[PDB]
Amino acid sequence: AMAAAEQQQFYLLLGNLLSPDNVVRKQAEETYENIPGQSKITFLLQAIRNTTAAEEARQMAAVLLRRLLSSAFDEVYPALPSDVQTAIKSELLMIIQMETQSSMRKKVCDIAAELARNLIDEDGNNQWPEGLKFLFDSVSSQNVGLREAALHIFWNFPGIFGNQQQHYLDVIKRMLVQCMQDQEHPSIRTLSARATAAFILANEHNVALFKHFADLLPGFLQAVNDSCYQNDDSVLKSLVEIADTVPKYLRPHLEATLQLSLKLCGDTSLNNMQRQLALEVIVTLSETAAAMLRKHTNIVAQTIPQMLAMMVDLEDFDSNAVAGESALDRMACGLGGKLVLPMIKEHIMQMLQNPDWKYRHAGLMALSAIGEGCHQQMEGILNEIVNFVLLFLQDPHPRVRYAACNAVGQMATDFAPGFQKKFHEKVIAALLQTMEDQGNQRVQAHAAAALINFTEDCPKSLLIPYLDNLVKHLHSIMVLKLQELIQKGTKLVLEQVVTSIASVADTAEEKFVPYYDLFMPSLKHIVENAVQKELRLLRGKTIECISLIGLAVGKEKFMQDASDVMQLLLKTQTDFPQISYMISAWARMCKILGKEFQQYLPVVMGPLMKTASIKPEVALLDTQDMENMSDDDGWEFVNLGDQQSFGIKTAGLEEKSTACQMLVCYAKELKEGFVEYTEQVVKLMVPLLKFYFHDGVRVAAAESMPLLLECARVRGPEYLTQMWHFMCDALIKAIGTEPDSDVLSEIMHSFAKCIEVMGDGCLNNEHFEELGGILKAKLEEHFKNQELRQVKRQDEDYDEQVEESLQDEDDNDVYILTKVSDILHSIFSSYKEKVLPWFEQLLPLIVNLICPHRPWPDRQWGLCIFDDVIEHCSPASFKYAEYFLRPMLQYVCDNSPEVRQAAAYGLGVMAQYGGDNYRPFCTEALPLLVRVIQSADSKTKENVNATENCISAVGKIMKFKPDCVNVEEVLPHWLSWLPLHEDKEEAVQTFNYLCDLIESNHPIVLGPNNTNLPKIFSIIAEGEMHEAIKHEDPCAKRLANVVRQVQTSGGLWTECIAQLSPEQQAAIQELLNSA
């Protein structure tokens, strides 16, 4: 071996990774990246192990090994040899054991904790007992460095035990208690308090463990106070995590926890971030533990002056004023206006009358803040408030006028539509007067912003009566501001006015037609003059306005300018934030232009792919990283375990998603014209299934797939097969890996659609094998969750909020089950009997859904699955009847209408498709089905679909198995049960059989002397319930031929028609003219 020579070369690489020049630093990062993860781990662990080597190289290797075990544990350790794996573990514990340097000691404790985390099996037990053993012995240890190391590992991964309660519980308690009482050490107390919070957060529903650890809470609070008056918000951030995820832990010392938060918040000597985070404890509690906070209204009453005081400190998102109004909003919403409005109401009234403008400004912002959560309680004072607020548009201080504009536009959102209905006269006049007649251009722009809110939430009917005077003023404003844009380049007010015109046009719809020529030429002269980079937001808002004007007037009015606008829209990229506006303008263009938009696809498809391909910026690092990048405002983080957080650049995520949705639109709406761009978008959308940063991106990626196969079908089946081969493996891997239930249901439904498109032969043996295991696991997970919800409903942590959560999980699980059935139906329809051997692996789990002690959605969907086996996989399906045949016959009289429907459907397709082996069962099924049909309230809203399927099944037995039933005796009864209209598919089935019966050479269905013909006409006349589709259904023609044959018997025709109502006779004519 060349191990020492390779390690020596690895040591030179670490040096180059820390070189000043980015030439060698990039050449080392490229080299490091190509080293297999299995070689990396040994190389890095050996570098850390050599303490006689450069300290900087050792620190580099520790950070690199910490990242390695986080980012890809599975790619590196599981594959390593067993002796190599045994050596990794013992070595890591030896490094921590012999380390002198505290900076290194901490980093190796992080590496040990990350490795320990990935060595816990599914059953819940430690696979590295030596790690847990080291932790246990280092707590006792005389070496302070080892006591600190055991604490560090535990803080990082407090789930280090599978016998946490079982025996070690008091060992943990005593350990945290000693390290928090020990005022002869500084870092140990802070670390111990954070470790406590971390252990509690890792035991989310353990009410008994909270009671057992409630003793440590007074001590944790002392550490919150202590660390804070030493500029350390670490333990105060732990407290905010407690209130958020696990507030029940605070209950034994809630008064103390609340008092501390109020004190830190009202303490002038603390920084803005510390005071905001302290307020955050009380605010979070109003959202997560309101019923608990509602017992201490005394503290909530004292929080109000604190938030108001913050709002008064004016002189931006991270300012006390902005933090204060946001907290007031969330708290009013969390606790409701019945409790909050009485507290804040009088404070606001006194602030509005105060001679200091900062109080008037804050009183108006506090009024805007409480509208979301106190508006039901504010309806009686609303008129008085609006009059008070309108007069602040004349306040001596301009900033107070801006806040009055803000309040007007906030009231137009919170109190809509009632606000618009009652106040349009005073409000529209004050807003227009402040826009036109006021000399301060900043108040004008704030007033236009409130007008957009008023019209955006004003219903069309409420807007139309005064549209003329509104449009009249907005035109005058636009015209005068356009003169200023030409000669001085001023755009502040014009930006808001253009959007106000767009909002008015979007509400008015066809009512904006007479006003099209009053704005449109002027709007085109705004985009041409906005070639400058400074006028980019204006040019974007104006493109939004032109497209929103065109969308309201329709394709006929917008047609004369549609080519001018499309050309001028593509001129923006050749003569140069604004991407979002252009992307949305083209969506409007297509929606108006219909299939004639196809000619513009070559010029818009370029930038549409470019924005659907934007890459996000990946962020990692430990504790102090999420607070240092709040200035951006477009950078969001998610607090993962180990305090090590993941961040993403929120900047292009919404544009990336919007563009993806446009390609979906184009593939289904411009089908014929999208074919040329199919192979490129298939390659774009396939890796987008694993884009775990944006839910809407994965949904769009999933929705695109069956739409892309319809385009690929016009080319031929060869292109279609190679397009399907790009997405088949990716779609299956996404079903087994998708974390979101809503996104998974979309992936499952698109996979199901693609199979129906492709037909038989679309899946290979590896894809069937992976699918079987994936669907088996989804079914196993369906049943574990039901068991878990049952035990969680008897837990000591059970409550109103837990109850709400469990019902949402149950609903999602039911929805996923509907999608398992969807994927199965398309496999059974395509493959028919060939796929029954493959289906056997799912058979135990599917038959489990139809166990009588399972919830009704389980029995329903288990029967839907067996209905597809009968319909598409017969006569082979009879080999499996020991699994479903007797349960379907017993389930036809079930208490659930949904279950009765699934069972009755199965009994009908058993008659039609099953074969001669089901004949004895067809005989038994008839009386059971008649019993459900004749049962009272069978045709009510809740039971009509189940009943219609019972009538349909009876008909399929009579039609396909006449030898198993007395058709001549059942026939007059079955004729009385018609017509069906709720279930259109089954209305067709019965209408086809009724036609067979009438057309028969022995038509006993007419009765003696054709006495049932009026009834037959009444049934058919219920072609007013849209059951018989004149077009695609050939039975519409057969029903018309039956009816028109009666015309040849004058008296019989006159009598059948005279017994119908005027709306029924006009339905018989409509049918006769169409078929």
Binding site: C864, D867, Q901
Partner: peptide
């Protein structure tokens, strides 16, 4: 969607 409707369903059976």
């Amino acid at each position: 969607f409707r369903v059976r």
